[PDB]
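2.7 Reproducibility. Because tokenized structures are sensitive to small changes in the input, we list the exact sequence used for Ferrienterobactin-binding periplasmic protein, including any N-terminal residues retained from the expression construct. No trimming or masking was applied before prediction.
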Amino acid sequence: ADWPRQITDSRGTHTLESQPQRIVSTSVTLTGSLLAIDAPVIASGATTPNNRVADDQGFLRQWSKVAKERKLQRLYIGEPSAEAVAAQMPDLILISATGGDSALALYDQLSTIAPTLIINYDDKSWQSLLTQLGEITGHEKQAAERIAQFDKQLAAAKEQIKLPPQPVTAIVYTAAAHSANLWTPESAQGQMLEQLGFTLAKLPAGLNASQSQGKRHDIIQLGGENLAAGLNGESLFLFAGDQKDADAIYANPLLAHLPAVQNKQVYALGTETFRLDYYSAMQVLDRLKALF
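Resulting structure tokens (single pass, no recycling of outputs):
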């Protein structure tokens, strides 16, 4: 049997009583890395899930886990519920540092249900994040194998394509859902792109509080008409939205006068590429390889 192990966390000092059989999280990146390192999660963050319900997508440990409770599908930030969590009788629960869903108001509710763990949202790319998962016993060697092959693929891929001289950035702006997020070098998405062969810029620290007048060091979320003169617009990447979405977005009269659009310096990360994780990279890499 396996005994308790000290696991590093965002808090300051967290430990594990025993290898948790059930894991609950809302991180898209974590959900992927979990599958890659063989360790599916009962609940994950996403949008209108359907691929998971699909046939044995390769993981047969999801049919039982989900069927064990209430075939609970993937969740999505903005669906807090103590009763719903309890019904899933989970063992390990991950809570985001900050967001729409309060952590303190759930910490007690979650702690009682099961060991409550505090982890920042998007604070470790598939690189460090994957290594953290490997920390598990009998997972290092296997991890190195997967990482080695993955690293090799990226290596050659990096020496196969080269982006023209100039800084690039990635941001998501959608009115439909009425929300937008700006990526950065610190963000997992920025780090991943950097690995592929892209340069990520750091938004100004002055406009940071241009919109969000609180605390969001983890990520920079803006929207004020201060982004026009903020982001140079040398190469803006978009999430689930191909040249089609960008073709329409160019409607924004205020942001229409964006030089990037005029020079058509806008690109997309793919449509179904809504979810961002270790797997998303492979999909993203394929898009880049086909993009050029």
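The beta strands are 5-7, 14-16, 23-24, 92-95, 116-118, 169-174, 179-182, 236-240, 266-270.
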